[PDB]
PDB file of C-alpha atoms and ligand atoms in Angstrom:
ATOM      1  CA  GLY A   1      -3.176  15.080  -4.956  1.00 40.06           C
ATOM      2  CA  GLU A   2      -6.781  14.905  -3.815  1.00 40.20           C
ATOM      3  CA  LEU A   3      -7.475  14.231  -0.138  1.00 40.45           C
ATOM      4  CA  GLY A   4     -10.156  11.880   1.161  1.00 42.63           C
ATOM      5  CA  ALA A   5     -11.678   8.702  -0.206  1.00 42.08           C
ATOM      6  CA  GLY A   6     -14.636   9.678  -2.400  1.00 41.51           C
ATOM      7  CA  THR A   7     -17.128   8.183   0.055  1.00 39.47           C
ATOM      8  CA  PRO A   8     -20.012   9.973   1.774  1.00 37.30           C
ATOM      9  CA  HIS A   9     -17.992   9.831   4.995  1.00 38.88           C
ATOM     10  CA  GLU A  10     -14.775  11.136   3.380  1.00 38.74           C
ATOM     11  CA  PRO A  11     -15.457  12.944   0.098  1.00 39.29           C
ATOM     12  CA  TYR A  12     -12.572  13.800  -2.211  1.00 38.60           C
ATOM     13  CA  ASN A  13     -11.365  17.321  -1.483  1.00 36.86           C
ATOM     14  CA  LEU A  14      -8.501  19.588  -2.522  1.00 38.10           C
ATOM     15  CA  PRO A  15      -7.451  22.361  -0.121  1.00 38.69           C
ATOM     16  CA  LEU A  16      -6.351  25.586  -1.750  1.00 37.56           C
ATOM     17  CA  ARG A  17      -2.635  26.228  -2.053  1.00 32.69           C
ATOM     18  CA  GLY A  18      -1.388  28.932   0.292  1.00 35.16           C
ATOM     19  CA  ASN A  19       0.631  30.407  -2.566  1.00 36.92           C
ATOM     20  CA  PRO A  20      -0.265  30.530  -6.269  1.00 41.22           C
ATOM     21  CA  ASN A  21       1.140  28.134  -8.822  1.00 41.19           C
ATOM     22  CA  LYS A  22       3.175  29.534 -11.715  1.00 39.73           C
ATOM     23  CA  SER A  23       0.000  30.761 -13.461  1.00 41.99           C
ATOM     24  CA  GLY A  24      -1.341  32.574 -10.387  1.00 42.50           C
ATOM     25  CA  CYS A  25      -3.811  29.843  -9.416  1.00 42.86           C
ATOM     26  CA  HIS A  26      -4.442  28.636  -5.859  1.00 44.02           C
ATOM     27  CA  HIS A  27      -6.748  25.824  -6.986  1.00 43.03           C
ATOM     28  CA  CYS A  28      -5.083  23.500  -9.487  1.00 41.39           C
ATOM     29  CA  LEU A  29      -2.839  20.567  -8.654  1.00 39.76           C
ATOM     30  CA  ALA A  30      -0.783  21.319 -11.763  1.00 40.46           C
ATOM     31  CA  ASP A  31       1.989  23.905 -11.584  1.00 41.84           C
ATOM     32  CA  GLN A  32       0.528  25.650 -14.663  1.00 42.07           C
ATOM     33  CA  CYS A  33      -3.070  26.205 -15.744  1.00 41.90           C
ATOM     34  CA  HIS A  34      -5.415  28.523 -17.652  1.00 43.60           C
ATOM     35  CA  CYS A  35      -7.885  29.490 -14.917  1.00 41.57           C
ATOM     36  CA  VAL A  36      -6.904  33.151 -14.587  1.00 44.88           C
ATOM     37  CA  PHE A  37      -6.640  33.509 -18.370  1.00 43.09           C
ATOM     38  CA  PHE A  38     -10.218  32.239 -18.622  1.00 43.31           C
ATOM     39  CA  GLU A  39     -11.381  34.380 -15.706  1.00 42.86           C
ATOM     40  CA  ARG A  40     -10.097  37.455 -17.534  1.00 45.49           C
ATOM     41  CA  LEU A  41     -11.161  36.495 -21.072  1.00 46.05           C
ATOM     42  CA  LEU A  42     -14.712  35.589 -20.052  1.00 46.13           C
ATOM     43  CA  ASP A  43     -15.124  38.874 -18.167  1.00 44.79           C
ATOM     44  CA  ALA A  44     -13.881  40.888 -21.144  1.00 47.66           C
ATOM     45  CA  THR A  45     -16.170  38.953 -23.493  1.00 47.31           C
ATOM     46  CA  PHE A  46     -19.336  39.418 -21.445  1.00 44.47           C
ATOM     47  CA  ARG A  47     -18.411  43.046 -20.747  1.00 43.13           C
ATOM     48  CA  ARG A  48     -18.104  43.799 -24.475  1.00 42.65           C
ATOM     49  CA  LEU A  49     -21.346  41.976 -25.337  1.00 42.91           C
ATOM     50  CA  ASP A  50     -24.345  44.290 -25.590  1.00 46.22           C
ATOM     51  CA  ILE A  51     -26.683  41.575 -24.254  1.00 44.84           C
ATOM     52  CA  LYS A  52     -26.106  40.518 -20.656  1.00 46.43           C
ATOM     53  CA  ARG A  53     -26.800  37.380 -18.656  1.00 47.94           C
ATOM     54  CA  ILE A  54     -29.978  37.244 -16.590  1.00 49.14           C
ATOM     55  CA  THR A  55     -28.436  35.863 -13.408  1.00 48.74           C
ATOM     56  CA  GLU A  56     -31.642  35.633 -11.367  1.00 48.58           C
ATOM     57  CA  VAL A  57     -35.358  35.917 -12.089  1.00 47.14           C
ATOM     58  CA  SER A  58     -37.431  36.869  -9.058  1.00 45.23           C
ATOM     59  CA  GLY A  59     -40.158  34.234  -8.782  1.00 45.67           C
ATOM     60  CA  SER A  60     -38.421  31.476 -10.819  1.00 47.39           C
ATOM     61  CA  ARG A  61     -35.572  30.109  -8.694  1.00 47.34           C
ATOM     62  CA  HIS A  62     -34.913  27.296 -11.189  1.00 49.82           C
ATOM     63  CA  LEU A  63     -33.765  29.920 -13.718  1.00 47.17           C
ATOM     64  CA  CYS A  64     -30.769  30.947 -11.581  1.00 42.94           C
ATOM     65  CA  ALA A  65     -27.724  31.078 -13.856  1.00 49.86           C
ATOM     66  CA  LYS A  66     -24.860  31.644 -11.410  1.00 50.15           C
ATOM     67  CA  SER A  67     -21.742  29.939 -12.637  1.00 47.17           C
ATOM     68  CA  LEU A  68     -19.241  27.253 -11.888  1.00 45.08           C
ATOM     69  CA  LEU A  69     -16.002  29.220 -12.069  1.00 43.16           C
ATOM     70  CA  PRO A  70     -12.978  28.397 -14.254  1.00 45.82           C
ATOM     71  CA  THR A  71     -11.203  26.838 -11.269  1.00 42.91           C
ATOM     72  CA  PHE A  72     -14.105  24.404 -10.866  1.00 42.88           C
ATOM     73  CA  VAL A  73     -13.969  23.564 -14.584  1.00 45.66           C
ATOM     74  CA  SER A  74     -10.225  22.879 -14.608  1.00 45.96           C
ATOM     75  CA  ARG A  75     -10.705  20.386 -11.782  1.00 46.81           C
ATOM     76  CA  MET A  76     -13.804  18.926 -13.458  1.00 42.03           C
ATOM     77  CA  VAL A  77     -11.914  18.230 -16.687  1.00 43.21           C
ATOM     78  CA  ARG A  78      -9.490  16.130 -14.637  1.00 44.50           C
ATOM     79  CA  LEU A  79     -12.041  14.405 -12.409  1.00 43.52           C
ATOM     80  CA  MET A  80     -14.293  13.405 -15.315  1.00 43.19           C
ATOM     81  CA  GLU A  81     -11.370  12.401 -17.578  1.00 41.92           C
ATOM     82  CA  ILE A  82     -12.694  14.515 -20.447  1.00 43.50           C
ATOM     83  CA  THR A  83     -10.852  13.729 -23.691  1.00 45.78           C
ATOM     84  CA  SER A  84     -11.082  15.028 -27.252  1.00 46.76           C
ATOM     85  CA  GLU A  85     -13.143  11.946 -28.172  1.00 46.44           C
ATOM     86  CA  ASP A  86     -15.737  12.761 -25.498  1.00 46.34           C
ATOM     87  CA  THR A  87     -18.887  14.772 -26.090  1.00 47.45           C
ATOM     88  CA  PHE A  88     -19.593  17.219 -23.268  1.00 49.72           C
ATOM     89  CA  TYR A  89     -23.187  18.170 -22.450  1.00 46.87           C
ATOM     90  CA  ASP A  90     -23.974  21.104 -20.173  1.00 46.17           C
ATOM     91  CA  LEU A  91     -27.621  20.578 -19.182  1.00 44.68           C
ATOM     92  CA  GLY A  92     -28.579  24.127 -18.274  1.00 46.25           C
ATOM     93  CA  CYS A  93     -25.639  25.930 -19.838  1.00 47.44           C
ATOM     94  CA  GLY A  94     -26.514  29.504 -18.873  1.00 45.75           C
ATOM     95  CA  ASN A  95     -24.121  31.929 -20.544  1.00 44.11           C
ATOM     96  CA  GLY A  96     -22.101  29.049 -22.028  1.00 44.11           C
ATOM     97  CA  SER A  97     -18.929  29.716 -20.027  1.00 43.55           C
ATOM     98  CA  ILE A  98     -18.434  26.034 -19.144  1.00 46.03           C
ATOM     99  CA  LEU A  99     -18.721  24.931 -22.775  1.00 43.04           C
ATOM    100  CA  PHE A 100     -16.113  27.457 -23.891  1.00 42.77           C
ATOM    101  CA  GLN A 101     -13.523  26.285 -21.372  1.00 45.42           C
ATOM    102  CA  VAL A 102     -14.074  22.544 -21.796  1.00 45.96           C
ATOM    103  CA  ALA A 103     -13.732  22.916 -25.569  1.00 44.14           C
ATOM    104  CA  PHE A 104     -10.488  24.843 -25.117  1.00 40.66           C
ATOM    105  CA  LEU A 105      -8.939  22.495 -22.557  1.00 39.54           C
ATOM    106  CA  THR A 106     -10.002  19.154 -24.082  1.00 42.51           C
ATOM    107  CA  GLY A 107     -10.995  19.514 -27.741  1.00 41.73           C
ATOM    108  CA  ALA A 108     -14.250  17.695 -27.033  1.00 37.16           C
ATOM    109  CA  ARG A 109     -17.419  18.509 -28.920  1.00 36.28           C
ATOM    110  CA  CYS A 110     -19.559  20.596 -26.560  1.00 37.41           C
ATOM    111  CA  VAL A 111     -23.364  20.764 -26.475  1.00 36.31           C
ATOM    112  CA  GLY A 112     -25.293  23.162 -24.250  1.00 37.29           C
ATOM    113  CA  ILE A 113     -29.026  23.003 -23.563  1.00 39.62           C
ATOM    114  CA  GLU A 114     -30.748  26.033 -22.036  1.00 41.33           C
ATOM    115  CA  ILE A 115     -34.418  26.772 -21.399  1.00 45.93           C
ATOM    116  CA  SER A 116     -33.879  30.541 -21.083  1.00 48.35           C
ATOM    117  CA  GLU A 117     -34.155  32.001 -24.579  1.00 45.95           C
ATOM    118  CA  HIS A 118     -32.324  35.137 -23.461  1.00 46.98           C
ATOM    119  CA  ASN A 119     -29.378  33.381 -21.822  1.00 44.35           C
ATOM    120  CA  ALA A 120     -29.113  30.921 -24.713  1.00 42.77           C
ATOM    121  CA  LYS A 121     -28.749  33.959 -26.973  1.00 44.64           C
ATOM    122  CA  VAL A 122     -26.089  35.363 -24.630  1.00 45.53           C
ATOM    123  CA  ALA A 123     -24.201  32.067 -24.895  1.00 41.44           C
ATOM    124  CA  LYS A 124     -24.387  31.895 -28.694  1.00 43.12           C
ATOM    125  CA  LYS A 125     -23.245  35.499 -29.154  1.00 42.97           C
ATOM    126  CA  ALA A 126     -20.403  35.041 -26.662  1.00 47.67           C
ATOM    127  CA  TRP A 127     -19.081  31.951 -28.467  1.00 45.83           C
ATOM    128  CA  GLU A 128     -18.853  33.947 -31.710  1.00 44.79           C
ATOM    129  CA  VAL A 129     -16.635  36.493 -29.937  1.00 43.88           C
ATOM    130  CA  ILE A 130     -14.526  34.210 -27.773  1.00 40.66           C
ATOM    131  CA  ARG A 131     -13.796  31.431 -30.282  1.00 39.80           C
ATOM    132  CA  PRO A 132     -11.534  33.522 -32.580  1.00 37.16           C
ATOM    133  CA  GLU A 133      -9.743  34.893 -29.517  1.00 37.43           C
ATOM    134  CA  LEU A 134      -9.088  31.394 -28.180  1.00 41.56           C
ATOM    135  CA  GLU A 135      -7.952  30.308 -31.645  1.00 41.59           C
ATOM    136  CA  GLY A 136      -5.592  33.243 -32.149  1.00 39.49           C
ATOM    137  CA  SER A 137      -4.210  33.054 -28.615  1.00 41.10           C
ATOM    138  CA  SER A 138      -3.506  29.304 -28.739  1.00 38.81           C
ATOM    139  CA  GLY A 139      -2.901  28.726 -32.455  1.00 38.50           C
ATOM    140  CA  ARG A 140      -5.320  25.771 -32.427  1.00 39.49           C
ATOM    141  CA  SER A 141      -8.747  25.449 -34.007  1.00 40.43           C
ATOM    142  CA  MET A 142     -11.496  25.014 -31.431  1.00 40.96           C
ATOM    143  CA  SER A 143     -13.882  22.091 -31.294  1.00 40.51           C
ATOM    144  CA  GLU A 144     -17.571  22.620 -31.998  1.00 42.91           C
ATOM    145  CA  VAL A 145     -19.864  24.316 -29.480  1.00 43.37           C
ATOM    146  CA  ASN A 146     -23.591  23.948 -30.200  1.00 46.12           C
ATOM    147  CA  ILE A 147     -26.289  25.706 -28.150  1.00 42.79           C
ATOM    148  CA  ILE A 148     -29.839  24.317 -28.071  1.00 44.85           C
ATOM    149  CA  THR A 149     -32.657  26.510 -26.748  1.00 44.18           C
ATOM    150  CA  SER A 150     -35.095  24.061 -25.172  1.00 46.32           C
ATOM    151  CA  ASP A 151     -36.426  22.495 -22.030  1.00 43.18           C
ATOM    152  CA  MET A 152     -33.900  19.694 -21.570  1.00 43.01           C
ATOM    153  CA  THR A 153     -36.708  17.182 -20.981  1.00 40.54           C
ATOM    154  CA  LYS A 154     -37.813  17.529 -24.607  1.00 44.63           C
ATOM    155  CA  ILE A 155     -34.291  16.756 -25.825  1.00 41.06           C
ATOM    156  CA  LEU A 156     -33.600  13.862 -23.454  1.00 42.19           C
ATOM    157  CA  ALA A 157     -36.959  12.210 -24.232  1.00 38.11           C
ATOM    158  CA  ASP A 158     -35.257  10.657 -27.287  1.00 40.67           C
ATOM    159  CA  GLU A 159     -33.873   7.304 -26.138  1.00 36.34           C
ATOM    160  CA  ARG A 160     -31.353   7.433 -29.008  1.00 36.94           C
ATOM    161  CA  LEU A 161     -29.525  10.460 -27.589  1.00 36.08           C
ATOM    162  CA  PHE A 162     -25.964   9.673 -26.437  1.00 37.31           C
ATOM    163  CA  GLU A 163     -26.119   6.135 -27.791  1.00 36.29           C
ATOM    164  CA  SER A 164     -23.772   6.557 -30.763  1.00 36.02           C
ATOM    165  CA  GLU A 165     -21.106   7.982 -28.412  1.00 38.64           C
ATOM    166  CA  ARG A 166     -20.457   4.560 -26.794  1.00 37.76           C
ATOM    167  CA  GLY A 167     -20.004   6.039 -23.328  1.00 36.40           C
ATOM    168  CA  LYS A 168     -17.643   8.788 -24.534  1.00 36.55           C
ATOM    169  CA  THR A 169     -20.126  11.151 -22.935  1.00 40.04           C
ATOM    170  CA  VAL A 170     -19.689  13.698 -20.149  1.00 42.43           C
ATOM    171  CA  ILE A 171     -22.768  15.333 -18.616  1.00 40.83           C
ATOM    172  CA  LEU A 172     -22.776  18.345 -16.299  1.00 41.44           C
ATOM    173  CA  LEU A 173     -25.985  18.949 -14.337  1.00 38.93           C
ATOM    174  CA  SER A 174     -25.813  22.094 -12.172  1.00 39.16           C
ATOM    175  CA  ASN A 175     -29.150  21.253 -10.585  1.00 37.89           C
ATOM    176  CA  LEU A 176     -29.019  22.775  -7.087  1.00 38.02           C
ATOM    177  CA  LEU A 177     -32.068  24.904  -7.933  1.00 32.35           C
ATOM    178  CA  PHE A 178     -33.788  22.514 -10.344  1.00 30.47           C
ATOM    179  CA  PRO A 179     -37.250  21.313  -9.290  1.00 27.96           C
ATOM    180  CA  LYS A 180     -37.132  17.888  -7.690  1.00 29.12           C
ATOM    181  CA  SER A 181     -39.352  16.530 -10.478  1.00 25.76           C
ATOM    182  CA  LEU A 182     -36.693  17.450 -13.043  1.00 23.31           C
ATOM    183  CA  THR A 183     -33.852  15.848 -11.105  1.00 22.13           C
ATOM    184  CA  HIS A 184     -36.038  12.787 -10.582  1.00 24.20           C
ATOM    185  CA  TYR A 185     -36.822  12.630 -14.303  1.00 23.05           C
ATOM    186  CA  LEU A 186     -33.111  12.892 -15.097  1.00 23.33           C
ATOM    187  CA  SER A 187     -32.266  10.121 -12.624  1.00 26.11           C
ATOM    188  CA  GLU A 188     -34.621   7.763 -14.456  1.00 27.43           C
ATOM    189  CA  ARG A 189     -33.343   8.698 -17.911  1.00 31.36           C
ATOM    190  CA  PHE A 190     -29.652   8.442 -17.025  1.00 30.55           C
ATOM    191  CA  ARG A 191     -30.106   4.808 -16.009  1.00 33.86           C
ATOM    192  CA  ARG A 192     -30.408   4.158 -19.753  1.00 33.99           C
ATOM    193  CA  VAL A 193     -27.354   5.996 -21.113  1.00 35.84           C
ATOM    194  CA  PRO A 194     -24.390   3.879 -22.297  1.00 36.44           C
ATOM    195  CA  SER A 195     -21.699   2.389 -20.087  1.00 37.50           C
ATOM    196  CA  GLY A 196     -18.751   4.734 -19.615  1.00 34.54           C
ATOM    197  CA  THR A 197     -20.846   7.897 -19.400  1.00 37.03           C
ATOM    198  CA  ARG A 198     -19.820  10.235 -16.564  1.00 37.53           C
ATOM    199  CA  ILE A 199     -22.371  12.512 -14.864  1.00 36.96           C
ATOM    200  CA  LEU A 200     -21.689  15.349 -12.396  1.00 39.27           C
ATOM    201  CA  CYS A 201     -24.556  16.611 -10.234  1.00 40.03           C
ATOM    202  CA  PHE A 202     -25.119  18.701  -7.099  1.00 44.66           C
ATOM    203  CA  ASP A 203     -28.582  17.612  -5.929  1.00 44.83           C
ATOM    204  CA  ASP A 204     -27.758  13.918  -6.027  1.00 45.54           C
ATOM    205  CA  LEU A 205     -29.516  11.911  -8.721  1.00 40.33           C
ATOM    206  CA  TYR A 206     -28.911   8.655  -6.780  1.00 40.77           C
ATOM    207  CA  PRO A 207     -28.868   9.487  -3.056  1.00 41.83           C
ATOM    208  CA  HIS A 208     -26.464   7.080  -1.392  1.00 40.89           C
ATOM    209  CA  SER A 209     -25.455   8.563   1.962  1.00 40.28           C
ATOM    210  CA  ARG A 210     -27.532   6.146   4.056  1.00 39.43           C
ATOM    211  CA  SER A 211     -26.609   2.524   4.683  1.00 40.72           C
ATOM    212  CA  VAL A 212     -29.970   1.317   3.318  1.00 40.53           C
ATOM    213  CA  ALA A 213     -29.586   3.032  -0.063  1.00 40.42           C
ATOM    214  CA  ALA A 214     -28.225  -0.127  -1.701  1.00 40.77           C
ATOM    215  CA  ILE A 215     -31.192  -2.097  -0.342  1.00 38.55           C
ATOM    216  CA  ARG A 216     -33.671   0.587  -1.468  1.00 39.23           C
ATOM    217  CA  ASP A 217     -32.250   0.955  -5.001  1.00 36.66           C
ATOM    218  CA  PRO A 218     -29.911  -1.926  -5.856  1.00 37.50           C
ATOM    219  CA  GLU A 219     -30.257  -1.102  -9.566  1.00 36.71           C
ATOM    220  CA  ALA A 220     -28.561   2.259  -9.031  1.00 37.19           C
ATOM    221  CA  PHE A 221     -25.514   0.554  -7.514  1.00 35.20           C
ATOM    222  CA  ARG A 222     -25.403  -2.051 -10.287  1.00 33.49           C
ATOM    223  CA  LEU A 223     -25.541   0.685 -12.941  1.00 35.55           C
ATOM    224  CA  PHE A 224     -23.321   3.393 -11.416  1.00 35.24           C
ATOM    225  CA  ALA A 225     -19.986   3.771  -9.671  1.00 36.45           C
ATOM    226  CA  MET A 226     -20.592   6.643  -7.241  1.00 36.12           C
ATOM    227  CA  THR A 227     -18.002   9.124  -5.964  1.00 37.26           C
ATOM    228  CA  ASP A 228     -18.491  12.032  -3.542  1.00 40.03           C
ATOM    229  CA  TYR A 229     -16.538  15.296  -3.742  1.00 37.07           C
ATOM    230  CA  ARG A 230     -16.258  18.721  -2.157  1.00 37.01           C
ATOM    231  CA  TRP A 231     -16.013  21.663  -4.520  1.00 37.25           C
ATOM    232  CA  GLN A 232     -13.041  23.879  -3.780  1.00 36.22           C
ATOM    233  CA  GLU A 233     -13.430  27.065  -1.780  1.00 33.55           C
ATOM    234  CA  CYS A 234     -14.103  30.023  -4.097  1.00 30.84           C
ATOM    235  CA  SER A 235     -14.763  27.772  -7.118  1.00 29.48           C
ATOM    236  CA  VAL A 236     -18.494  28.531  -7.505  1.00 27.63           C
ATOM    237  CA  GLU A 237     -20.022  31.951  -8.065  1.00 26.95           C
ATOM    238  CA  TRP A 238     -22.826  31.662  -5.505  1.00 25.09           C
ATOM    239  CA  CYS A 239     -20.688  30.821  -2.459  1.00 21.18           C
ATOM    240  CA  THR A 240     -17.166  31.420  -1.188  1.00 20.62           C
ATOM    241  CA  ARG A 241     -17.125  28.196   0.845  1.00 23.12           C
ATOM    242  CA  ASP A 242     -17.032  24.535  -0.168  1.00 23.96           C
ATOM    243  CA  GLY A 243     -19.945  22.176  -0.768  1.00 25.03           C
ATOM    244  CA  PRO A 244     -20.860  18.727  -2.073  1.00 26.86           C
ATOM    245  CA  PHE A 245     -21.087  17.360  -5.564  1.00 29.48           C
ATOM    246  CA  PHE A 246     -21.219  13.873  -7.022  1.00 31.39           C
ATOM    247  CA  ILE A 247     -19.875  12.125 -10.098  1.00 30.96           C
ATOM    248  CA  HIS A 248     -21.722   9.037 -11.308  1.00 29.34           C
ATOM    249  CA  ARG A 249     -19.965   6.808 -13.838  1.00 32.77           C
ATOM    250  CA  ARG A 250     -22.082   4.311 -15.753  1.00 35.65           C
ATOM    251  CA  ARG A 251     -20.677   0.811 -15.293  1.00 38.47           C
TER     252      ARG A 251
HETATM  253  N1  LIG B   1     -35.628  22.378 -17.864  1.00 41.98           N
HETATM  254  C1  LIG B   1     -34.530  23.051 -18.189  1.00 41.98           C
HETATM  255  N2  LIG B   1     -33.972  22.909 -19.437  1.00 41.98           N
HETATM  256  C2  LIG B   1     -32.833  23.594 -19.794  1.00 41.98           C
HETATM  257  N3  LIG B   1     -32.248  24.444 -18.885  1.00 41.98           N
HETATM  258  C3  LIG B   1     -32.796  24.592 -17.655  1.00 41.98           C
HETATM  259  C4  LIG B   1     -33.939  23.907 -17.281  1.00 41.98           C
HETATM  260  N4  LIG B   1     -34.244  24.252 -16.011  1.00 41.98           N
HETATM  261  C5  LIG B   1     -33.320  25.140 -15.575  1.00 41.98           C
HETATM  262  N5  LIG B   1     -32.426  25.354 -16.585  1.00 41.98           N
HETATM  263  C6  LIG B   1     -31.250  26.212 -16.620  1.00 41.98           C
HETATM  264  O1  LIG B   1     -30.140  25.620 -15.941  1.00 41.98           O
HETATM  265  C7  LIG B   1     -29.190  26.634 -15.618  1.00 41.98           C
HETATM  266  C8  LIG B   1     -28.530  26.336 -14.284  1.00 41.98           C
HETATM  267  S1  LIG B   1     -27.225  27.513 -13.830  1.00 41.98           S
HETATM  268  C9  LIG B   1     -25.896  26.557 -14.607  1.00 41.98           C
HETATM  269  C10 LIG B   1     -25.090  27.364 -15.620  1.00 41.98           C
HETATM  270  C11 LIG B   1     -23.854  26.631 -16.120  1.00 41.98           C
HETATM  271  N6  LIG B   1     -24.155  25.260 -16.516  1.00 41.98           N
HETATM  272  C12 LIG B   1     -22.789  26.615 -15.030  1.00 41.98           C
HETATM  273  O2  LIG B   1     -22.694  25.640 -14.281  1.00 41.98           O
HETATM  274  O3  LIG B   1     -22.021  27.564 -14.872  1.00 41.98           O
HETATM  275  C13 LIG B   1     -29.959  27.961 -15.674  1.00 41.98           C
HETATM  276  O4  LIG B   1     -29.428  28.780 -16.681  1.00 41.98           O
HETATM  277  C14 LIG B   1     -31.414  27.605 -16.005  1.00 41.98           C
HETATM  278  O5  LIG B   1     -32.017  28.483 -16.897  1.00 41.98           O
HETATM  279 CA1  LIG B   2     -30.026   3.251 -23.761  1.00 43.23          CA
HETATM  280 ZN1  LIG B   3      -5.929  26.757 -12.163  1.00 44.37          ZN
END
């Protein structure tokens, strides 16, 4: 039900419904969803936790931990075709909210990497509270959620990472406020992940809006199928309006 073409000229976009679906959601294509349930459960979890997310750090803009909201995640699970056989990596996982929802909706193994020691601790403690609640509410056992406290560059420096997954790999990179050197580093490293891997980014790893891009970087076009999207209105914490993001699929 997505509008547009997925090109720079006509990115894929999904207007909000005027009226809610059966589950109260204005965002999802499906008539039923879990977005409000996750909205409410996450808020109760973080409210009960004694340790709180550090959303911003004055002086270190790259540490900003504002969230992709549950409505964004429900759409992302569909757009990136996340299955139970996939492994989902949130590079910069913040409070872990994305991991918790992807695990619940897909059954995929979920790995978060976070440089903030405090927010990594928030994420780990929140998973211990929310997992039983998800499991009791749904009657299903949850997949594994592992939180790594590290600069992601130290983890990704291992060329063997991702390789055993045979492309059953989904990577989220919420890098709007990452330093350009980090996004550039990631763009080099992701050229070498296996075929089938799907990568979502906001500051584009492989800029492709200009006609000359395929002449400037033909390798990028040989290695990736590129699709442009607009995030839905009111689907990201830091902005009520829409904006661009990109999914790169390794050919
Ligand atoms: N080099 C690095 N290694 C690991 N995490 C990093 C990092 N540089 C920035 N980050 C983290 O990346 C996060 C981006 S905010 C994204 C939060 C979550 N993934 C969501 O989308 O809702 C921040 O928490 C910040 O601390
Ligand atoms: Ca490789
Ligand atoms: Zn929904």
